[PDB]
Design a protein around this nucleic acid. Structure first.
Ligand code: MG
Ligand code: MG
Ligand code: MG
Ligand code: MG
Ligand code: MG
Ligand code: MG
Ligand code: MG
Ligand code: MG
Ligand code: MG
Ligand code: MG
Ligand code: MG
Lengths: 236, 60, 130, 140
RNA sequence: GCGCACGGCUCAGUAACACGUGCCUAACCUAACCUCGGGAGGGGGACACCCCCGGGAAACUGGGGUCAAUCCCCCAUAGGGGAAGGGCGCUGGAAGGCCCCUUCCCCGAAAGGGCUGGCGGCCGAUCCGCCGCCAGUCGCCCGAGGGUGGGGGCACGGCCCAUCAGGUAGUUGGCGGGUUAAAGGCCCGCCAAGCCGAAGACGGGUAGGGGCGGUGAGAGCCGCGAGCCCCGAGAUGGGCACUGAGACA
């Protein structure tokens, strides 16, 4: 399967005309094609550690790159929102976070919050045994007992332990929390949740965010709760 | 040479039947001196299909 | 099956009754169909497992002898035997040729039952006593 | 009809190639594949101990086509082959129209494949302990 | 084993759900990949290369012998499908869905395989392996979701001609079925007379659609709407199938 350079996502940090007629195509990983960047692009463009595609594949082939605690040796692995990228031989850590300019950015983070990942609940399914399965914004799943999974509704953000496969902290979606817009024109904006026009489809509800006193509006689908007045993990 | 090969093939097949019944050492006994016999007459390659089968039977 | 002889693609006729051209020259294999596989009344049960689109499987009853008749008044399931097909409301030609389809009546050992499954697709005859 | 018989010994894994002619030629015509004829017919060509009946296994025609056991009668035919006997497919599921011949022998067959059928319980020496070309190469 | 259904070419067919925009599939399938939960027990077989012979001009191809598998097959369990009755529960705008309970019928997994290191045992220089375990790593099977690709549906938008005015009879709809991965006159049995049309049917002609491009101060006119990108269709004309996740290639 190919990806023409014209059909590449608009926000990717690559020149549109100059270059080849091809772009590296992500291999159906834990994100969406429109909202993910392949690992070889990050190693060559965003970190500039490789000057060619073979050099980027060589760096990835050694297992030097760790993505969310798992060494990825696939150069077409997709990276997306709230993912933790760690470079082993240099010890630097980044969290791909919603950016006001690049639309998605590699921000350095402290080593303590490297195992933590904030995940937005995209939905729940009832599985065998009566347990509940949670689906997150990057396709990741987590099966829970029925009573604990009853109190986690959709669009709630949960801080997930990659190290323990557990839920550190559950952040319900209520009016008055700190949210970051994760898609759309108003990307990168972090503000208080203070207004909602509940539509018939909840995913299409109009939501307003405030930062004293710049007010931006989006739909309810495009905002992730990052907690109260203090963001739980460094995003900006 | 057909005389020496006929008994050799006869001795190779008989050890094959032994190897199917569990007698590995006696079958290994037959396979040994047949290997002695075919080596100096150049009949090793001629019996190549049978030496391949016999060792497969003993390797089981 | 996906056979062009049983093509399930759209007609070449407009709702006004006028004719329209062919946008595509060939018949797509995805839009292909298959011949009927409804079982015939036989002295033993013969089941055929068929590979279908996406590497899936469908159970086909080539020849039917028993029916899993269920008694609503007693809440018991019996694997009774089939003696004749009484009548097929969808088409009498199914009963006339001893072919079991959903909604058909069968004079089973326990009595009469209405076939409640699609025996060409389910692969078994689930029946409910009348 | 002239023939190039391929007589293979199962107990030695070697084959001897006899060229049948006039007197035995009608002993082979009309025989289907898998047939049983006693080994004494080839007495003037080969020595076979009296527990062996040579079995008919197949052959090829004058134009190189092989005989097909699944086709009956002595006739030429075209088949949409999908398997080994008369076809070696190169891709999975590939079916090809191949020319074959019936299993019943006839004058146009040039190669006839026959294999010795040793008697039950026989454990003597091999009827064909070596190949002719192999032995000639070995001596050289 | 995986790939070759991507990629490359062209513009005959097409006035159409083809194309464009905006929405759906609660009526669907998806190998490779990602995540969570679970599993990997027992037993068999064949066919190449090769060896002994060939046949045939060539294409191709026959017989016997013989070593293997992440090759093929069986058994078990998990699981899966159908029909029927109940339910607190889940999703979701809304359950013919998911989950749990009960009855029966039916189908029905797996490669613990490779490598590395460590341990121990069997065995032998005619062996240079086999076995048990442990760890690391790359893999295999099932359930759920995602991802990607694809099948299908809808609202609206975009040519000319009346020196083309009535057209349609599976045609329009209903009911019951078959088939499909999946809804549908897609197909079939029965019932009705409906469906389209001067707000232009039907017929004819022309044309792949779009992003767009030329020109003009502009409205606009034209398509050089060839080249680059997206969608479509095709592979001398017309048809029909195998394999496969996917082709009617
Ligand atoms: Mg193409
Ligand atoms: Mg063989
Ligand atoms: Mg396999
Ligand atoms: Mg299910
Ligand atoms: Mg089984
Ligand atoms: Mg095995
Ligand atoms: Mg239906
Ligand atoms: Mg029609
Ligand atoms: Mg060109
Ligand atoms: Mg044609
Ligand atoms: Mg072709």
């Amino acid at each position: 399967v190919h990806l023409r350079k014209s059909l590449a996502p608009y926000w990717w940090p690559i020149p549109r005309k100059a270059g080849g007629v091809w772009a590296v195509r992500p291999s159906t990983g834990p994100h969406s094609l429109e909202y993910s960047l392949p690992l070889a692009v990050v190693v060559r463009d965003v970190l500039r550690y490789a000057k060619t595609l073979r050099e980027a594949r060589y760096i990835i082939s050694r297992g030097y790159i760790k993505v969310d605690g798992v060494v990825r040796k696939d150069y077409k692995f997709p990276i997306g929102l709230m993912d933790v990228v760690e470079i082993v031989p240099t010890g630097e850590i980044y969290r791909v976070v919603p950016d006001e300019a690049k639309y998605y950015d590699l921000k350095p983070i402290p080593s303590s919050e490297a195992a933590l990942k904030p995940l937005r609940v995209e939905g729940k399914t009832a599985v065998s045994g009566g347990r509940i399965q949670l689906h997150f914004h990057d396709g990741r799943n987590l099966i829970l007992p029925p009573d604990v999974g009853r109190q986690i509704k959709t669009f709630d953000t949960v801080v997930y332990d990659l190290e323990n496969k557990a839920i550190k902290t559950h952040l319900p979606l209520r009016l008055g929390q700190l949210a970051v817009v994760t898609h759309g024109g108003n990307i990168g904006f972090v503000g208080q949740f203070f207004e909602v026009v509940w539509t018939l489809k909840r995913r299409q509800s109009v939501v307003a965010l405030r930062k004293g006193e710049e007010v931006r509006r989006t739909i309810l689908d495009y905002i992730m709760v990052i907690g109260t007045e203090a963001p739980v993990v460094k995003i900006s | 040479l057909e005389a020496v090969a006929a008994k050799l093939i006869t001795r190779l097949r008989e050890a094959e039947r032994l190897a199917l019944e569990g007698k590995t050492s006696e079958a290994k006994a037959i396979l040994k001196e047949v290997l002695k016999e075919a080596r100096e007459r150049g009949l090793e390659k001629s019996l190549r299909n049978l030496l391949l089968r016999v060792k497969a039977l003993l390797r089981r | 099956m996906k056979l062009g002889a049983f093509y399930k693609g759209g007609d070449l006729v407009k709702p006004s009754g006028g004719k329209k051209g062919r946008v595509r020259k060939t018949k797509k294999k995805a839009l292909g169909g298959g011949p009927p596989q409804i079982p015939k009344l036989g002295e033993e049960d013969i089941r055929y497992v068929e590979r279908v689109r996406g590497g899936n499987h469908k159970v086909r009853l080539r020849q039917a002898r028993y029916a899993n008749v269920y008694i609503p008044k007693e809440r018991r399931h019996v694997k009774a035997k089939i003696l004749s097909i009484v009548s097929s409301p969808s088409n009498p030609d199914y009963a006339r040729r001893n072919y079991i389809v959903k909604g058909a009546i069968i004079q089973t050992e326990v009595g009469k039952a209405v076939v409640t499954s699609r025996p060409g697709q389910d692969g078994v005859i689930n029946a409910v006593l009348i | 009809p002239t023939f190039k018989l391929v007589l293979s010994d199962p107990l030695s894994g070697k084959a001897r190639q006899f060229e049948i002619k006039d007197p035995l030629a009608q002993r082979f015509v009309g025989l289907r594949i898998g047939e049983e004829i006693d080994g004494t017919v080839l007495k003037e060509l080969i020595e076979l101990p009296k527990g062996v009946k040579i079995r008919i296994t197949g052959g090829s025609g004058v134009e190189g086509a092989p005989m097909h056991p699944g086709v009956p009668g002595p006739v030429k035919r075209y088949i949409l082959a999908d398997g080994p006997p008369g076809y070696r497919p190169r891709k999975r599921g590939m079916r090809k129209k191949k020319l074959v011949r019936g299993d019943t022998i006839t004058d146009s067959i040039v190669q006839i494949n026959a294999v010795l059928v040793y008697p039950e319980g026989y454990s003597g020496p091999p009827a064909i302990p070596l190949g002719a070309k192999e032995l000639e190469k070995l001596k050289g």
